[PDB]
Amino acid sequence: EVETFAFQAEIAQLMSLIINTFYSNKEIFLRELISNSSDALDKIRYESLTDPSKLDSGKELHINLIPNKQDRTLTIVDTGIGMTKADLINNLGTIAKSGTKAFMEALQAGADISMIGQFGVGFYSAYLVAEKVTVITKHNDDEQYAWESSAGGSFTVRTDTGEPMGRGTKVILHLKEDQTEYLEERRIKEIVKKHSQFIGYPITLFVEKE
Ligand SMILES: NCCNC(=O)[C@H]1O[C@@H](n2cnc3c(N)ncnc32)[C@H](O)[C@@H]1O
Ligand SMILES: [Mg+2]
Ligand SMILES: [Mg+2]
């Protein structure tokens, strides 16, 4: 069973700005998604201090980058706190705790899209390079869910079965046809070293089987 939701208007507007603004420095999407993963890892790390059983779903705190040229996907995986169903809907579908409004105003006042993470909306930079984004997530004490959107003002949520994660989040970027440079090992390595070199968790770049 698939549920379909409308983005909050301001989030739809933000996504359209990201999709339609001419802006060549697209590579910053990866730093923003890695940063979100790092935040999620900080959160489960902290919660596990006072409740060690929260790591029963996996003790290792890390980030995996998985390119697949056959599927034309780049997946950012973490073993962070994950998201409940309500978290998915609120945190990806609405302004929530973010500086969405401040960012859109800033872009009219000299700011540029690379500053998106300063406003807590870095997730949407995925749409610089992806035509569709799928988010698979598992939080302690909720079930596994799949969130999905190709923008256009709506997203879907369904339960996800058959490939259970222990705990965390997978952001699957279905890349635009002209953005396949981000599947190349040397390109990914270059971007991680440039923008994500101080992240306090291991980042493992998977090798392609083909
Ligand atoms: N809708 C405004 C932007 N807010 C978010 O993208 C929020 O979604 C959640 N989020 C994004 N990527 C995540 C991730 N990899 N793990 C856990 N939560 C994540 C965070 O709460 C983040 O602040
Ligand atoms: Mg938020
Ligand atoms: Mg928990």
Curated annotation (Swiss-Prot):
Post-translational events: ISGylated. S-nitrosylated; negatively regulates the ATPase activity and the activation of eNOS by HSP90AA1.
Cellular compartments annotated: Nucleus; Cytoplasm; Melanosome; Cell membrane
Coiled coil: none
Region named Interaction with NR3C1: 1-210
Description of its domains: The TPR repeat-binding motif mediates interaction with TPR repeat-containing proteins like the co-chaperone STUB1.
Oligomer and partners: Homodimer. Identified in NR3C1/GCR steroid receptor-chaperone complexes formed at least by NR3C1, HSP90AA1 and a variety of proteins containing TPR repeats such as FKBP4, FKBP5, PPID, PPP5C or STIP1. Forms a complex containing HSP90AA1, TSC1 and TSC2; TSC1 is required to recruit TCS2 to the complex. The closed form interacts (via the middle domain and TPR repeat-binding motif) with co-chaperone TSC1 (via C-terminus). Interacts with TOM34. Interacts with TERT; the interaction, together with PTGES3, is required for correct assembly and stabilization of the TERT holoenzyme complex. (Microbial infection) Interacts with herpes simplex virus 1 protein US11; this interaction inhibits TBK1-induced interferon production.
Protein name: Heat shock protein HSP 90-alpha
